[PDB]
Structure formats: structure tokens, C-alpha cells
């Protein structure tokens, strides 16, 4: 058993943050003082890939294999998954990847990104969803799509599935959402790359469908990276997913060190959010270290030939070393880590963050399935308000937003100068009434879209966006026109 | 220069007839004793391969390169195109592929299956289509989809573009067809593999929608393989695209010579239709022979650390990319980038009949 272990690193484009994380994690392992914790020195041979020129990928992997490595940690996408995975399988070299898990079953490759199939199916069943839309792409394998279609067949769901991977025009998304609108479909299940998720959310916000009664389910790890700033204020149910839990000791212990790292040495270290891929990279370092520590615990021999063998001369000990990376049980940043005989992660935990501010909504496990945890002002001005239109509009807005409203006549009995004064000074919350729009009033309070005028809300009030969306919906439904 | 030239073969899994046609064309090229049409003997170190295992593809290509080959002929599917095309571009080894045009500009390759997007656009313009549904597949390249999207945007058409191709159960096809029916769509543009085309046609005929007043555009070079029968019933208009003419004496001679071939020695010969891929392969042999003859008249490790290329590969590519030979598919003239330049696609309707010519410089010209 050698006293120094060298492993290779393959990083595709736009992987700077996890490159820094990989370097930081290997440094953390190396700087350990305990002999048992650091039984040997660890070296990392980093490289880069293009994922488009297969010759470049083959040359990089060939250099890594020839120069001599014991394990290869790296990423891959749909373009270069087959090449690297097949070479690793043929060469009997363990390949640790935090990339998307391979839909097909391939040996000698370990993939640490937990599958969303179980959690997504359990949550979908838990919400009593029966008819919905399924927007997807195909850059993370076909596991999710196949599972969703099979579940729909078994449970007689009404799943309208659309692929948006090939879409390059936003107007395509706009037409798709308008079509699902005319079909009245309200529940969406989006599982795409963060970029396409952001584009779809931007398009739907522009069209104005982020209101109560519309659900969303971003079935994609990396809830933080999603630009959901606008949609939150729309008051539309959103269900996300995340693996790392902040409050556990491990994440805090890591991040405390991480925030203080050099910016030049570690790009996107201090000033970037910790993407879950970085967490999985840290877990990769932990699992490799534990596996090799276990190897040295026993007397297993570990010890590189031509790049392309005729027909094949895989060094035997590889089958042993791969087996070592299958029974590992170290509790890393993401939580429990355990690998099935094939390589896919098992016994994992998923945290289902639900929006409404972000708040946890239980958790999902392979064994336990899913376990969860106003004043209105009006002026007594006929015919808008008469002692027994504006009352009907207020009731319609409350219904469309679901808020409990209590009507009242402004004490001053006069317009702003006052009702607007009542809003500004902090009382009466919302206010719906005939208010002539003047540039001065925008300084103090925020209006809604004109409906003949506009509903009034205090500046910065959380109800401004919901009331604006409700007014827009009423205007486009023709009810506002019908009332007059 | 040398009396013998050895080419390499990289036939796919389901290409038995193409293999037989390749061997037959090799025999034709090596049998003429003219001393001018055949100044260099030809040999083929054909090697089979399978997709889904890039290791096998790379190892086979490396072995072929090591054996020493002036030019390589072979097919590639969407899931192995990158490896072969990129190796050939990097190693300066000309690749002749009668499979499908590449979706992007790549040097050091010769795609012959002519791009049919232009003919599709021209014929759609001629027919005055503005409300046609689109059912595309991703197993043949993204060029057609992008071209049709651009045309729809520019020409202000509206097209419903479903994403068939990931569908493994016919119930989804039934749902798609009935949903388009609810939209009263009456014109279809289907771009998928032959098996998917057959499945869609079977589903639509099962739904009894093949009646008159509907037009299916079968945008696939393979027309004979498609089961048009049972769809001509009901008077449903259908249009195809076939490049192999069956009138000129060249194809008649090639057919009459083809049937006599032994079934055992040459499987799928004299007992099956002439897949256009086989004709393209014969044209491949013709063009390779012509380029090598013109060049005459006028080795190492694949994964080399510095990736040093050939000293004469560029000459071979230049010789290949310029040719004006005549084969079954028509006149074979390649553009700078490896695609053909005079498609002469023949448009067939359903009644059957030849309808179109579509020389790229010209436009669609119906026969009166
Ligand atoms: C391509 C071709 O036809 N090559 C030769 C031609 O040059 C020659 O005149 C003829 C008989 O001499 O034999 C043949
Ligand atoms: C670029 C090119 O070769 N264009 C050809 C032209 O030279 C030829 O005269 C014509 C008739 O065959 O067909 C086309």
C-alpha cells in the first residue's frame, strides 16, 4: 500500500466554484494532523474538458489514465457522458461524479446526486394531484420522464407533457403557457436546467400568472440558484428541493472556513453562494478519503499500461477498489451517504422547501416516503358606495386573493392630500376606491393597473403585487367591464 | 500512387444491405480492366461496431487508423456522431458518411444524404400552407427543426410543434392526433425515423382519420420502406421525397446486375427493396474512386500526445470534396463544407407519380 495517493480531476466548462471547492476540500484533508485521519498524502491532478470535441475529452482522459491515478473525480453532460462512462467501465477505474445520475445501469461509476424520482413521485401523490402539466428537458437522463409517464399510466393521471430543451424562442414558452391557460391547467411540474427554469419563470411573470391558485414544482436540485425573486411576491405555491441543511453542524463548520478563503486562490469562494454541486464535491473528497482509509485498514494490495489495450488489460485490483467505494457510510455535508451495488446513492434524505418566505415542509426518505411537519377604506360617494360597484370590486379582489376584508369609510371623508394619509401613516392596510392617478401619489403609495384610477396600497406593502395581479385578471376576464 | 489503396469500413448494427452494396460496388470498381478507370486496386478492411459503447467505437477507429487507411466509410447515429466526426476532423482522415448531414459545420467529412430542409420550405411555400402541425424527431439532426422555426417566424405561419420521439406507447400518439383534431388541423409535417413514421401512420389509420381532406408530409428520404398502403384509402393526400430515380439506364443496369447476386453471399439482395442508403453507398465508392484517380493523374497511433496530423490528408480531402460524377442519386457535387450542391430531389405525391424537381438554384417546378 503506497503512502501517497494521486487522483485525477475532470472539470467541464463553468465549473470554477466547484473547482475551488475541490481544492479546498483536498487541502482540508491534507492539513489534518491526526495520523489516523491523514494516513497518507493526497495529490490531485486537475484538468479541463470541452464536452463538444470528443477528441479533446478522449485525450484528457487518456493523459489522466497514462500519468497514473487511482480514482477519477469529474463531471459530464449529455454530450460527454457516454465517452467517459464507457472508458471508465472498460478500464475498471472508479469514476466519482456529482453530475446527473446515469439513467442506465453502468458499473465502475459512482454517482452522488440523489435521484428525484422517489421524492417527486411521493410528493406528487401527497398533494392529490390528478391533472397537470409537465415541462421538461432531457439533459439529466430519462429517469424522471419515464417514471412520471409510468406513474400517470398506473394512476390514470392527466399529465400533459412538453419538452422545452429544443426551444430557443421565449415566445414558444409564452404560447405554451397560454395554451395551458385556455385548457385551464393550473398545476405545473417543471424539471429543466436552472437556465430554462429561470427563463420560464421570467416569461410567466411577464404574462402575469404568479397569483394564488397556481401551483409550481421546481423538481430540480439547486433551489437557491433559481431567480425566484419576483414570483415569491405573487403568492403562488412553489415546491422546491434541497439536500444540504444549513443548521446541521457539518454545513456550518464548513461554511465558516469557506467564507474566509482567499478570493484570488479560490475564485467565487467568498462572494458566491454554495451551490449543491460544491457540497457534493466535498462529499466526494470525504468518500474517497474514507474508502482509501478502509483500504489501508486491511491488507488489500493497490497498484499504468497503454492508453488503448488490445483487447483489454484492466488492472485487477480496480474491481476491489470500486467495491470499497460501495459500502462507505460517512455522514458528509449532504447527510447520510450510502451506495447500492450498482453505484446509485441510497438511504438519502431530501428536504422539501415550500414557499409562500422559504419554509421547510418536512422531508422525504426512501424508507419513510414523505413526512411533513385586512382593513379596506372607501369613500361614501354614490354610486360607487351606497348605503343599503366599488363594494363588488373589493369583494372580487378579496376572493381572487383570498384575504379577509373589513370595509370602512375614511373618517376624514376626503381624498388624499385624508385616505392617502391614512394609508401612509400606517393604518387601514389596503384601500380600494376611485383615486385619480397623480405623479405625486406614487411617491407615498403604490397603485394598481388602471381599471377605468386604480386600487391603492402602501408603498412596499406585500399586497401590492397580489392586488395588481387580481385587478389584471378581473380586467382581462371582462368582469370589470361587465360591472359598469 | 501505390498500386493498392485500402479503405476502412465502420458499418452500423442494422446495415446488412448497405454492407452488401458496399462489397458489390468494391467489386465493380476493382473488376474493370480499363487501366484508366481502374489504375489503382481497391481493398476494404471493413469493421463492424455498435452504439451505446463509445469504447468500442473509439477502439475500432483507432485500430482502423493504425492499420493504415487513406479514407474511411461508415455510418453514425446521433449518439456516436461526435466521437467519429471529431476524431476524423482532428486526425485529418476523410470520412464518407451516407447517414445524414451534420447539424453543424465540421471539416474533414463528406455528408452525402442531401439536406431536405430546402425542398420542404419550397414545397410548403408552393402549397400555401399556414396552419400545419409539426411532429419532429431528434434522431436525425436539429437542422430541420431550426429551419422550420425560422421559416414560421419570418413567414408569419403558426405551427404546433409537438416533441414526438421520446414516446414509447402509442396511446400518446392517439392523444396527439385527437388533440390536433380538436384543433381542426388538416395538414401534417412528420419528420421521424421510418419506424416512427410507420407507427404514426398505423395509429392515425386506427383512429380512422385517413379520410380525404388531410395531407401528411413525410419528410424522410426513405419512401419505399414507409407503409403508404392502407393510407391511400380514404383519399388522403401524401407527399414524399425520394432521390433515387428509377428511369435512367444507370439504375436499371444496377438493379438487373443486383438481382443475380447470391442470397447467401449477399444477404438482402434480390429479395428486398433498394434502400436509398445502398445507392448512396454505391455513389460513395464511385466518388472515392474518382477522387483517387484524379489525385493520381494530377499511419501511427490515433491518440498521439501532440496529435500530429497527416502530411497529405488535406490533399485527399481537397480531391474528394470536388467531383462532378454521375450516380443513381444524380450529379454528385460537394460544397466546400462536405454537403452536396445539386440535390435534384424528386417529390412524389400519392394517387405514384413524380411531381417535383427542386434544383437548389431553381425552385419547385411541377410537371404539367
Ligand atoms: C472513362 C473512359 O471511357 N475511359 C476509357 C476511354 O478514355 C477510352 O477512349 C475507351 C476506349 O479506348 O475506354 C474507356
Ligand atoms: C455549382 C455547380 O456545380 N452547379 C452546377 C452547374 O455547374 C451545372 O452546369 C448545372 C447543370 O448540371 O448544375 C449545377
UniProtKB/Swiss-Prot annotation, chain A:
Catalytic activity entry: Ca(2+)(in) = Ca(2+)(out)
Membrane topology listed for this record: Multi-pass membrane protein
Positions annotated to bind L-glutamate: 434, 436, 441
Compartmental location: Cell membrane; Postsynaptic cell membrane; Postsynaptic density membrane
Glycosylation sites: 34, 237, 347
Keyword Lyase: no
Disulfide pattern: 62-307
Superkingdom in the source lineage: Eukaryota
Extracellular side: 1-452
GO biological process terms, semicolon-separated: long-term synaptic potentiation; modulation of chemical synaptic transmission; protein heterotetramerization; protein homotetramerization; regulation of receptor recycling; response to fungicide; response to lithium ion; synaptic transmission, glutamatergic
Keyword Ribosomal protein among record annotations: no
One cellular component term from this protein's GO annotations in UniProt: neuronal cell body
Keywords linked to the UniProt accession: Cell membrane, Disulfide bond, Glycoprotein, Ion channel, Ion transport, Ligand-gated ion channel, Lipoprotein, Membrane, Palmitate, Phosphoprotein, Postsynaptic cell membrane, Receptor, Signal, Synapse, Transmembrane, Transmembrane helix, Transport
CDD domains per the UniProt record, alphabetical: PBP1_iGluR_AMPA_GluR3, PBP2_iGluR_AMPA
Any one GO molecular function term: amyloid-beta binding
Additional free-text comment from the UniProt record: The postsynaptic actions of Glu are mediated by a variety of receptors that are named according to their selective agonists. This receptor binds AMPA (quisqualate) > glutamate > kainate.
Sequence similarity: Belongs to the glutamate-gated ion channel (TC 1.A.10.1) family. GRIA3 subfamily.
Protein purpose: Ionotropic glutamate receptor that functions as a ligand-gated cation channel, gated by L-glutamate and glutamatergic agonists such as alpha-amino-3-hydroxy-5-methyl-4-isoxazolepropionic acid (AMPA), quisqualic acid, and kainic acid. L-glutamate acts as an excitatory neurotransmitter at many synapses in the central nervous system and plays an important role in fast excitatory synaptic transmission by inducing long-term potentiation.
Oligomer status and interactors: Homotetramer or heterotetramer of pore-forming glutamate receptor subunits. Tetramers may be formed by the dimerization of dimers. Interacts with PICK1, GRIP1 and GRIP2. Found in a complex with GRIA1, GRIA2, GRIA4, CNIH2, CNIH3, CACNG2, CACNG3, CACNG4, CACNG5, CACNG7 and CACNG8. Interacts with CACNG5. Found in a complex with GRIA1, GRIA2, GRIA4, DLG4, CACNG8 and CNIH2.
Name assigned to this protein: Glutamate receptor 3
Species the sequence originates in: Rattus norvegicus
Amino acid at each position: 500500500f503506497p503512502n501517497t495517493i494521486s487522483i485525477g480531476g475532470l472539470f467541464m466548462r463553468n465549473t470554477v466554484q466547484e473547482h475551488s471547492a475541490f481544492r479546498f476540500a483536498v487541502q482540508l484533508y491534507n492539513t489534518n494532523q491526526n495520523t489516523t485521519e491523514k494516513p497518507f498524502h493526497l495529490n490531485y491532478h486537475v484538468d479541463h474538458l470541452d464536452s463538444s470535441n470528443s477528441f479533446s475529452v478522449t485525450n484528457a482522459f487518456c493523459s489522466q489514465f497514462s500519468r497514473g491515478v487511482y480514482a477519477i473525480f469529474g463531471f459530464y453532460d449529455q454530450m460527454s457522458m457516454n465517452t467517459l462512462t464507457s472508458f471508465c467501465g472498460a478500464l475498471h477505474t472508479s469514476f466519482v461524479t456529482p453530475s446527473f445520475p446515469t439513467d442506465a445501469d453502468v458499473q465502475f461509476v459512482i454517482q452522488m446526486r440523489p435521484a428525484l424520482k422517489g421524492a417527486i413521485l411521493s410528493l406528487l401523490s401527497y398533494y392529490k394531484w390528478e391533472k397537470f402539466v409537465y415541462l421538461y428537458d432531457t439533459e439529466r437522463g430519462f429517469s424522471v420522464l419515464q417514471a412520471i409517464m409510468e406513474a400517470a399510466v398506473q394512476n390514470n393521471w392527466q399529465v400533459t407533457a412538453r419538452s422545452v430543451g429544443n426551444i430557443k424562442d421565449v415566445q414558444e414558452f409564452r404560447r405554451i403557457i397560454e395554451e395551458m391557460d385556455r385548457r385551464q391547467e393550473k398545476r405545473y411540474l417543471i424539471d429543466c436546467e436552472v437556465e430554462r427554469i429561470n427563463t420560464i419563470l421570467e416569461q410567466v411573470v411577464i404574462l402575469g400568472k404568479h397569483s394564488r391558485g397556481y401551483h409550481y414544482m421546481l423538481a430540480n436540485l439547486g433551489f437557491t440558484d433559481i431567480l425566484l425573486e419576483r414570483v415569491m411576491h405573487g403568492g403562488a405555491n412553489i415546491t422546491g428541493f434541497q439536500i444540504v441543511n444549513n443548521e446541521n453542524p457539518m454545513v456550518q463548520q464548513f461554511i465558516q472556513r469557506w467564507v474566509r478563503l482567499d478570493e484570488r486562490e479560490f475564485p467565487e469562494a467568498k462572494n458566491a453562494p454554495l451551490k449543491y454541486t460544491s457540497a457534493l464535491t466535498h462529499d466526494a473528497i470525504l468518500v474517497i478519503a474514507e474508502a482509501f482509509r478502509y483500504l489501508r485498514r486491511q491488507r488489500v494490495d493497490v497498484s499504468a499500461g497503454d492508453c488503448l489495450a488490445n483487447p483489454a488489460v484492466p488492472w485487477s485490483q480496480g474491481i476491489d477498489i470500486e467495491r470499497a467505494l460501495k459500502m462507505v457510510q460517512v455522514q458528509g455535508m449532504t447527510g447520510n451517504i450510502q451506495f447500492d451495488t450498482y453505484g446509485r446513492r441510497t438511504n438519502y434524505t431530501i428536504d422539501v422547501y415550500e414557499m409562500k418566505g422559504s419554509r421547510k415542509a418536512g422531508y422525504w426518505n426512501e424508507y419513510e416516503r414523505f413526512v411533513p411537519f385586512i382593513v379596506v377604506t372607501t369613500i361614501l360617494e354614490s354610486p360607487y358606495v351606497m348605503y343599503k360597484y366599488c363594494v363588488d370590486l373589493a369583494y372580487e379582489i378579496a376572493k381572487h386573493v383570498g384575504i379577509k376584508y373589513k370595509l370602512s369609510i375614511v373618517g376624514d371623508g376626503k381624498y388624499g392630500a385624508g385616505m392617502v394619509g391614512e394609508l401612509v401613516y400606517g393604518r387601514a392596510d389596503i384601500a380600494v376606491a376611485p383615486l385619480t392617478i397623480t405623479l405625486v401619489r406614487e411617491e407615498v403609495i403604490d397603485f394598481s393597473k388602471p381599471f377605468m384610477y386604480g386600487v391603492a396600497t402602501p408603498k412596499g406593502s406585500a399586497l401590492g403585487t397580489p392586488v395588481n395581479l387580481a385587478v389584471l385578471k378581473l380586467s382581462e376576464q371582462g368582469i370589470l367591464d361587465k360591472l359598469k
